[PDB]
């Protein structure tokens, strides 16, 4: 530990099986994405904010060549999770690589990943010093964060009702949307809120209605942005597209100081 | 029907002739402008793509470029945006073309997709809206060299009438690609051509978000009549979202008229 970086490479995937492939979003999100229940028989090894590799097909033509896709369950949990948005072209037409695999996929069939990937990944100390959080996600971005409120709350979907463990750092989530119908994990993070309303704040940024984005909602809240971030010093957690980046972080008017922001970007 | 010539199993020998900075030193990024040898072997039509496939002759996974030139030129030309992340990190390809040297082998494909020109264009004088964001410029570049007949050499000729209209999004004026190739054309067809270049670096201050998409809504009650009026073949190329507020523009001043919009994102 935690080494866990390329355990798996694609020189030596791990076979692993489907347990149960979701849906996350409702009608009226019009992109499709498939929350998968991946069984590793504990074997595949890594940490909260971290990405799994997954080579379409591994057993024509090959065929050797995958994609990450940022883990959403804790250390703690028997099989991981993993959020994959099916990307169409352009229904009942075309897909992209990986795409199509999961597309087709079925329970209980082969998917090969491949050892953990990326450093987007929690501090050490932070659930013993209380550490404040202020995570900003895109579409499927929030996966990692997902993780990261398993951790820090305990997670058992078997056991909701307690306790349960308190990090009592404070945690403000700005995500950005379609709309509701196409936010993953609304199951969680409205259960999250529900439990937790002094530790979790969810700002949602909705596309549909000049453009605004979840960069925008971060400006046109500024001052009161800031103050997180330095009074309470909100650790700073981007994850999703490029755009993000400037526009968040030239709002910085710095010092090696803003260690602790992570910057993700897909 | 040139379509998959070539296939990762026979992918085509071609030779790196000439690597250009295509950006000028205000843009934050990095894209470079390839001129490949292939002997005339590559089969295409203007609007095609071809597989690159990195470090061939370790994984055969070849990724998509749109062709930015026409078939009668020699060589065909493509241009690589180089992806970065922090935590000196490069892309697969993106690496590849980063390294990439003067006389190099570089193993292509056959060609693929069908965001191509209808067969009628020239002697039927058909007009145009095109949407590009960055790299996305590629295939309109490829159409205006052929549909004006371009020769880097000779600069006229050309016979087609119809009307070019581009909105293009960047993020400031030294991020157009291809400007070179943009403004001749501006300036020497200025009745069969004209550009919206709507530049990202505006909005980072205080204001909202404007894209490309914005300034077809903000001028929409003309981009209509540029369709509906003069009968339009509408290209979307670029990112996801150009699409739902144009098409979503499209129901207001109806459908079947589907054929005439060719949309390719990513
Ligand atoms: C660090 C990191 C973390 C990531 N985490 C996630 C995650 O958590 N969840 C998630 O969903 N994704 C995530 N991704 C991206 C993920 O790898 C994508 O699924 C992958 O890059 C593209 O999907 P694909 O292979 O199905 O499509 P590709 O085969 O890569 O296709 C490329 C894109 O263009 C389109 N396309 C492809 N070929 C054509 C063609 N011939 N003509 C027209 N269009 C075409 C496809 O629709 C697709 O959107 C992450 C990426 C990174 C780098
Ligand atoms: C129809 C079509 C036409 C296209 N035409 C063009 C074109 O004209 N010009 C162009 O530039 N592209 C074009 N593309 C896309 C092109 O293939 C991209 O260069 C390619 O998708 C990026 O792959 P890569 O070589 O950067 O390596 P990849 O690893 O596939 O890149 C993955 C992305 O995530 C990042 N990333 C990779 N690994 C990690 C990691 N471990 N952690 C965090 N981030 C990571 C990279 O920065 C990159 O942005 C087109 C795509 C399609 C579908
Ligand atoms: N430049 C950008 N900055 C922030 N959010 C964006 C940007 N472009 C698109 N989005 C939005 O991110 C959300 C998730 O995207 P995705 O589901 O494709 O991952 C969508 O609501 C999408 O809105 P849009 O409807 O304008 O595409
Ligand atoms: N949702 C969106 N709709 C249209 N254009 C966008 C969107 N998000 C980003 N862009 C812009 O597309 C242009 C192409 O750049 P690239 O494709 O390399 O990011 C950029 O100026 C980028 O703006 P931004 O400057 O906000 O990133």
């Known amino acids: 530990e935690n080494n866990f970086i390329n355990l798996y490479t694609v020189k030596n995937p791990l076979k692993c099986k489907i347990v149960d492939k979701i849906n996350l979003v409702r009608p009226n ?6 929350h998968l229940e991946i069984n590793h028989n504990g074997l595949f090894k890594y940490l909260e904010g971290h ?14 060549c ?6 959403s369950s804790s250390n ?5 999770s993993v959020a994959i948005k099916i990307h169409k072209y352009e229904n009942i037409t075309n897909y992209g690589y990986c795409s199509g695999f999961i597309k087709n996929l079925k ?3 082969d998917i090969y990943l491949t050892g953990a990937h990326g450093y987007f990944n929690l501090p050490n100390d932070a659930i013993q010093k209380n550490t404040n959080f202020i995570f900003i996600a895109t579409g499927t971005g929030i996966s990692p964060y ?10 058992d979907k078997n056991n909701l009702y307690n306790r349960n463990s308190n990090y009592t750092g404070y945690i403000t989530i700005y995500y950005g949307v379609y709309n509701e119908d196409s936010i993953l994990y609304l199951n969680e993070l409205e259960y999250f809120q529900k439990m937790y309303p002094n530790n979790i704040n969810i700002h949602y940024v909705f596309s549909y209605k000049t453009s605004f ?15 997180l971030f330095n009074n309470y010093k909100c650790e700073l957690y981007i994850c999703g597209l490029k755009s993000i ?8 008017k710095d010092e090696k100081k803003k260690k602790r922001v992570h910057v993700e970007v897909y």
Do not use: H, W
């Open 51 to 64: 990405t799994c590799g997954i080579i379409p097909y591994y057993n024509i033509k090959k065929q050797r």
């Open 66 to 71: 995958a994609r990450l896709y940022s883990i």
């Open 29 to 34: 999100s019009p992109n499709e994405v498939y």
């Open 146 to 155: 997902i993780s990261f409120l398993k951790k820090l709350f305990a997670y």
């Open 245 to 252: 980046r400037y526009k968040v972080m030239d709002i910085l």
């Open 107 to 109: 329970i209980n069939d």
């Open 213 to 227: 984005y979840v960069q925008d909602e971060i400006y046109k809240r500024k001052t009161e942005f800031l103050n």
């Open 76 to 80: 703690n949990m028997e099989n991981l």
